[PDB]
């Protein structure tokens, strides 16, 4: 009976309710990925390393972080470790927190 | 179960949020509010790689700037949204990779003894990695990857390339993992304001699907049914189309074709991707008999 | 009908049931052990029930000659399974059929009796050992019965239907050939007459 | 009053086939008797090859002539092990969920038909 | 563009023949574990080679041949690599009872110093000439066709074709085979004589 | 399978394949060689197998009469290749065909011999070196099946069958010109019975 | 440290498992020649059944007694039927052109080995 | 032990044909030989006009009256010299592909088929 | 021998050279044997130096007088490594496809060479 049916725009995220009540133009499971306008799946937009803060156990302890922009200028980000005030630049050169 | 923050953004719409148990992944929900249409409410979610847990997520508008913590050290980095843009000067192709940072190879590296040249992964990179799958790129194409030792990086910290390389513009990096599992393929029809009635009744075999790539790269779809896993790899262009020349980065539009064969009701077929070469997906098709039972 | 899982693993099966299945548009099976998918075992049972019934038909291979059923001496009274299909006695109008689970005399009206019976039976066998011809035969056969209990298919039915016509033609020509007999030289009637 | 298990089949002096016509859960259950002087068991590589599954053949040719009459096949599917058994995380299947019932019913029914 | 006498894979030419028939893209290599719709390929050839292989020709056939007994036993294994068994004369005794051939006359099956039949024993496809070789490839054709994603005039004039080609292959059979009604045959022979 | 780029080229090749894409629309290909379109490619290989199909049916020209395959000395082993089409011997009953890739005697049982030996075999040309008439069977018939796989048009087929078939009535009577056999001038059996 | 194309494994003792050095890309390629008596192929299928993909088991390990002495293990590639090659429409699988290389890689290691 | 590439043809009086079993990448590779007394070398245009890809012609009907028994046809592809060269630009296409992973396996199969 | 990739030089009472005929891609590949009595591999720099493409040096004075008489330079390219191994979406570069030829090319003309 030659069924076609072309779902063409894809997005839609992801669900995990039952496929007869699933949308069309839904999936289930993305990982990785930006959709949007235009373009459909794309693989999420990729990361450039910029810095090495800190040991995996100094800025640990499920720290607390504000991002404080300053001005287009300058832009610091300020974590809160659970024992002191320790702010990373954006850079990751670490401006030092003194008290 | 509990989200640290609900990080957000006006300039792009990606609403996010990361948490204590499953803290590898920082989830985006991307939303188009023109009138209160909500045209599009989608959740995916987003990966940083094994053993990875990901501090914090907050947004300078137009990029995010995410502290991700490898079991080992901690690392800084942006994420670009900007549409397509090369991110490092001089890459060939918005390369997708987890951490993306160029390195001179320094004079020093490289054996006459062994035509293979050294990199350092405590000292290319800033700190040393934890797991995962390593990539490097010269900035002409030529992927060459060197899967992880399965002592871990930090375990085993030389990687090699080969070729003396005394000078070049490599860039260096993790891979990324795509998966975007396509609906189970039933058959749906359109119905008032939207409803959408797919029909249970009946069994829909499907012979042949495919999906339209647009501007990319090896993209692998895997279609498993029950009892089966089969792997139908799409990658460069077809040989002899005045595409595949040598020497070129062999990304183009095309429509690959998968076949797949059997009961709709529990085949699933799954595009994975792993090379860094963006994967574009325009549209889906499944083509199949439906006679009702 | 003996059991449709209860056969064990075979490579010729797996063939058939990948054939089988492809006909309705299942794709091959990897292994025919462990497989979840029920259609895997709805076909497996239906090459197993066409597999009796084209035994049943007797053919040259299959009927064995007079064999003997020896009676259990203490029971006195020969047993009767289902992998008997037919009873026929050898020389003409046969006098036996099952009564319960027992072979049962007709004309004596007693099952009960000793010294065994020669009789030409139809044993059921395994879809293994069945020579090349018949199993082309039987996985079309099950192919069609197959498309038509569960895909709905108009067309493909039209073309398993020559193909297992065609190899009722192949098949019973082997089958011909194997018996060959030719009736001047073999005959009951004639090979007295012609001396 | 019919007795399905124990058959016993005349021995013959010159036939190395006799049906096994009761069921059997496994092979190794069913043991062969020969009879008339003494009691001999027999071994299935050793002389009775399984033929098909529902016929076994006997190398050897034992007949009268040796002074045995009788050959018997009788059911003793063991009690000691569950043939089956649900290991935990299986798919259960139909291999496994019938013969479970099964064993009890065949091995009791031995038990009642010798007496 | 020079001269080369260069040989492309034969068995996988035949897939990737079956492949183009329908217009699917030729596959370089059997090998990537997948490839279902061209796993068919492999599975349905050979199948329908063998099928081939058994309706008897004169060339299959081997005309006379001697399977050595096990020694141990005397039981000849009946592989599945046979596809038939039949005695030389007539009314051919022997079909396999379990794994090995047991003779239906004698109500044995162990028996020493071997036996005498005909067996049509499988070839691959390769090795095949060539007439059986294009009936074979068009009539998996045919059915790799209209089995998973059939369409009407492709079904149509393919099932032309392959009923074509069996002339082929019966034409060359007579004339390989070429037996003589008269003197060839020996019912006849004799009244020559 | 010779290999479909083994043609060097050839200008009677390119009128070829120009015409067989005309056939499903394709514009006429300037030069077959660096062509990037797969049709282009996809088309030489049916022009190429069709070719083998052709030749294969036995044809006047085309047989070689006996002609002799000489055995390597030190192998003691005929070289069979598929260039070969087919192998029947001059006289009746032909008793070779190949086992491995070496040609073997099915009657002795031994593939190895010496000597040599004469059969009519039917070796496979390439494209040109055909008749002309015989081009133009191949080159329709050829656009039939190209017509078939790729495109799914209903009428130019018809047209391309009847044409087919006219150009097999042409060819056929070609073939018998060239052959030209009368049955009282030649024969086997009525040579000797006319003197 | 070779991964010689040829382990020599003395056919004595009986273990299924003599364990192959070298890599196989498929089946048919690694050939057993039985010097001792006969250099001998057993079928691939009927003795040496490819049990394992490090070791082959055959039926039996035949014993010195059958005086079969030697059994040789080796992975000899077949020019005839490349194991891959690349045709037009083919799009590259990059796994392709490595597997090419490596088939023909192998034909030379053999090569290197033999001489 | 099949030798697939050397392989020597019995001269014969009066036969000016012989058909080369085995492949080659190109014409020149293949180098007849004449036996019995010495080798005597030919060259294509000279002597053995090329025929049909698969059959060579000897001019001058070498045979052994002039006491010369043996002709070999042999395969040394050359190794010197990459038939195949990927330059930079093309567009990479089957001739180009699959000869370079064959000239390897020819030639090295030459290797190891004289021994 | 012709082809040169076995050498055959002898042992000189002090050697501060060993002349090189052969081209090699990488320099691990040319491995050093003196065979006075057996073979004995030397490594690159603990023995001698790859000092120019042309030409290399051992140290010792290895002496006929002393046990070792034979100083064989040996071409050999290991299989296993490739300067190029296709990644997939790589870019298929020009150059390196020529030394995928070459890799494997070297392989066998050091065997074809050693008939």
């Known amino acids: ?99 | ?293 | 009908m003996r059991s449709y899982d209860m056969n064990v693993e075979t490579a010729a099966e797996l063939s058939a049931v990948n054939d089988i299945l492809a006909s309705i548009g299942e794709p091959p099976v990897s292994t025919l052990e462990g497989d979840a998918n029920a259609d895997a075992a709805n076909a497996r049972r239906i090459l197993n029930k066409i597999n009796r019934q084209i035994q049943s038909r007797g053919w040259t291979f299959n009927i064995e000659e007079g064999i003997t059923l020896l009676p259990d001496v203490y029971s006195n009274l020969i047993v009767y399974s289902d992998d008997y299909l037919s009873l026929m006695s050898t020389s003409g109008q046969s006098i036996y059929v099952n009564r319960g689970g027992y072979v049962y005399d007709r004309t004596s009206q007693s099952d009960r009796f000793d010294s065994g019976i020669t009789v030409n039976i139809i044993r059921l066998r395994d879809y293994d050992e069945m020579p090349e011809c018949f199993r082309y035969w039987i996985v079309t056969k099950a192919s069609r019965q197959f498309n038509n209990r569960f895909f709905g298919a108009p067309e493909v039915e039209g073309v398993l239907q020559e193909e297992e016509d065609e190899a009722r033609r192949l098949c019973m020509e082997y089958e011909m050939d194997y018996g060959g007999y030719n009736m001047l030289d073999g005959d009951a009637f004639t090979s007295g007459l012609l001396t | ?115």
Not at chain 1, 18 to 46: A, C, F, H
Not at chain 2, 13 to 25: I, T, W, Y
Not at chain 2, 111 to 127: E, K, R
Not at chain 2, 194 to 223: H, K
Request: proline content about 3%; glycine content about 8%.
């Open chain 4, 1 to 115: 009053n019919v007795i399905k298990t124990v058959l016993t089949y005349q021995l013959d002096g010159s036939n190395r086939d006799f049906n096994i016509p009761f069921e059997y859960l496994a092979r190794k259950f069913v043991v062969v008797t020969l009879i008339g002087v003494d009691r001999k068991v027999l071994t299935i590589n050793t002389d009775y090859r399984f033929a098909t599954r529902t016929t076994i053949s006997l190398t050897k040719a034992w007949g009268p002539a040796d002074g045995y009459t009788t050959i018997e096949l009788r059911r003793v599917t063991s009690t000691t092990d569950r043939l089956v058994d649900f290991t935990d995380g299986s798919i259960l299947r139909a291999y496994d969920l019938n013969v479970a019932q099964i064993q009890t019913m065949h091995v009791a029914e031995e038990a009642r038909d010798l007496t």
């Open chain 1, 1 to 99: 009976a030659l069924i076609s049916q072309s779902i063409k725009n894809l997005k839609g995220g992801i669900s995990q309710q039952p496929d007869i009540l699933r949308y069309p133009d839904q999936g289930s499971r993305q990982v990785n990925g930006w959709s949007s306008e235009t373009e459909g799946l794309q693989k999420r937009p990729p990361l450039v390393f910029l810095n090495t803060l800190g040991d995996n156990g100094a800025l640990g302890q499920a720290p607390y972080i504000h991002l404080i922009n300053r001005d287009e200028h300058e832009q610091y980000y300020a974590v809160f470790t659970g024992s002191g005030i320790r702010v990373f630049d954006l850079s990751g050169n670490e401006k030092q927190v003194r008290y």
């Open chain 2, 1 to 293: 179960n509990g989200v640290f923050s609900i990080c957000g953004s006006g300039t792009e719409n990606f609403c996010s949020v990361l948490s204590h148990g499953d803290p590898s992944k920082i989830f985006m929900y991307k939303f188009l509010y023109l009138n209160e249409e909500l045209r599009q409410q989608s959740w995916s979610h987003w990966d940083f790689g094994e053993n990875v847990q990901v501090l914090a997520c907050q947004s300078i508008s137009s990029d995010m700037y995410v502290i991700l913590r490898n079991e080992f050290n901690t690392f800084l980095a942006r994420i670009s949204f900007t549409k397509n843009a090369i991110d490092l000067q001089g890459e060939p192709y918005r390369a997708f990779m987890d951490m993306k940072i160029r390195y001179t190879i320094p004079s020093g590296t490289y054996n006459d003894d062994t035509f293979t040249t050294s990199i350092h992964i405590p000292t290319i990179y800033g700190a040393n990695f934890g797991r995962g799958k390593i990539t490097v790129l010269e900035p002409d194409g030529k992927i060459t990857v060197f899967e992880q030792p399965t002592a871990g990086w930090n375990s085993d910290p030389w990687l090699r390339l080969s070729g003396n390389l005394e000078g070049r513009m490599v860039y260096i990096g993790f891979n990324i993992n795509f998966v975007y599992e396509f609906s189970k393929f039933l058959i749906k029809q359109t119905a008032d304001d939207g409803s959408t009635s797919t029909e249970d009744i009946g069994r829909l075999q499907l012979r042949r699907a495919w999906v339209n790539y647009e501007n990319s790269g090896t993209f692998d779809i895997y279609v498993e049914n029950q009892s089966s896993n089969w792997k139908y790899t799409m990658a460069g262009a077809r040989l002899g189309s005045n595409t595949l020349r040598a020497g070129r980065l062999n990304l183009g539009t095309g429509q690959y074709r998968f076949p797949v064969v059997g009961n709709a009701k529990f085949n699933t077929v799954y595009i994975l991707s792993d090379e860094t070469t963006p994967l574009n997906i325009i549209g889906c098709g499944w083509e199949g008999n439906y006679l009702r039972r």
